[PDB]
Symmetry: C2
Subunit: 303 residues, 2 copies
């Protein structure tokens, strides 16, 4: 379904996102979500408010391009502009961060819909179908794989997220995954030009990491260049300990074990902003801390 070229691009990007213990940032919080978030620190869920907190993020020192490989965006954000009229879309394309687009059971028209984003500054997508049976599994999976196979046609690296929202977890995770990658091998996907955002099998980070790797190394091929875990609910310190642990786990791991965090990278930064554009530096620090912290968990050198 591809030409050497198309692959070269897909792989070049997939790897370039996790290249050196680098991870992925979630700047795709839905319109409501962002409000539940900004709510915790009593700021209104207004376009501006969002554009602002985010302007902060993407304006940190150009050394951030070392802990982050790419930032996924929510449609709106992906067309928002910084105080200078510059597109949040090019501010990243500069430093060296790749822009992603939260696409989300939306198979129809997600072709020319992608081809758009790709040519707007996005290079990879992100689709999600929740899991916690036989007709679902095979579906979400064959669904994923379907979705994925398109992005390839539209120079987009697809991050597959067969998440299993909250050891018994292992068995499940393994099966789901085993279906998922099988599914992909059928639609003749290009694993090498893929990525995987699996949940983190949730116990001490050691164990939590153990079970997790065993599962992945039992199912996810060595052709997938990376496995950026999502933190979904883990406190900023736990998402780091576990990713770290996962990287120290004594199992084979033919693939970059990274992070694709949102809450684990913002919680502190966002709480330090609280809407007062006067705390810009404070926010950028709580974010620089988490960004670096997890860049270490990704190379298992964190402590």
């Amino acid at each position: 379904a591809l030409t050497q070229e198309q692959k070269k691009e897909l792989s070049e990007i997939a790897q370039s996102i996790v290249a050196n213990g680098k991870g992925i940032l979630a700047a795709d919080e839905s319109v409501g979500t962002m409000g539940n978030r900004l709510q915790r620190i009593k700021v209104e869920n207004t376009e501006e408010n969002r554009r602002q907190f985010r302007e902060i993020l993407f304006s940190v020192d150009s050394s951030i391009n070392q802990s982050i490989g790419g930032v996924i965006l929510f449609h709106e954000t992906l067309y928002q502009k910084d105080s200078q009229g510059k597109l949040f879309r090019n501010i990243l394309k500069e430093k060296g961060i790749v822009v992603g687009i939260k696409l989300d059971q939306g198979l129809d028209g997600l072709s020319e819909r992608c081809a758009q984003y790709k040519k707007d500054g996005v290079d990879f997508g992100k689709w999600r179908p929740v899991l916690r049976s036989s007709l679902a599994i095979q579906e979400n999976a064959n669904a994923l794989a379907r979705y994925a196979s398109i992005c390839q046609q539209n120079g987009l690296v697809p991050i597959v997220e067969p998440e299993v929202i909250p050891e018994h977890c292992q068995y499940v995770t393994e099966k789901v995954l085993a279906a998922v990658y099988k599914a992909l091998n059928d639609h003749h996907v290009y694993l090498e030009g893929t990525l995987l955002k699996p949940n983190m099998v949730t116990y001490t980070p050691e164990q939590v990491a153990m079970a997790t790797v065993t599962a992945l190394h039992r199912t996810v091929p060595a052709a997938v260049p990376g496995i950026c875990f999502l933190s979904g609910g883990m406190s900023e310190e736990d998402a780091t300990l576990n990713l770290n642990a996962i990287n120290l786990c004594p199992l084979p791991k033919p693939w970059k074990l990274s992070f694709s965090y949102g809450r684990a990278l913002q919680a502190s930064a966002l709480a330090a902003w609280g809407g007062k554009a006067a705390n810009k530096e404070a926010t950028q620090e709580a974010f620089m801390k988490r960004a670096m912290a997890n860049c270490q968990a990704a190379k298992g050198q964190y402590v």
Copy 2:
């Protein structure tokens, strides 16, 4: 309802790894009654029982330093019960010269019991061989799988552009296994060599395939040589080990023709050429122990 208990796994894995542990490979001493004959036929021998037994006695009794290039030797039913010219048992001769013994199960029917036998006789690992076809054989190999492991043994998953095919088949095969809840870690894989070319390519395509389908839980992948001349089976395995792709698993060899061709031709039936045979075999044995470690220099 898991097929095994922490222990049972420990054993299965301990063996699977112990077979490929240090660039060590697997020997095919399972040639069928008919097969063996065709072989013995080239050297022009009669397909007796004895004739066979001796040739083999020669191999299995080679310099105890052979246990540095071979981790396991697969066997044909009859042989597992033959005795060297000293009444001693190959079953033990090989188990003493540090080499795990394998049994050919080639037939899904009432295999369990059949295995449980072998396991307690000195065997610890075994063998066995369009969308439809694939699924059947897939789910087939999965049964042969689960059963072996119920009985301490280790299933040697042996699955049958050749890339595209190899990948699909394999992708079905390992999926199949994940369903019957097999213990990949206590498994092994004898995939053919993704081939029609330089061992550089022949190896490339091959690895890409495997690393695209075979999990990192499978401790090893002992290729079969089926047809490659003794030198090609060595170059390719070597090449495969030098290929620049991730390879979370021991890439070994599970050869027959590639280890005997020369040795057998040096024996020709004359028990008087015992040393000559044991050399042509010692050469291939070591030669491929290097390809397994991609340390094989080919003058």
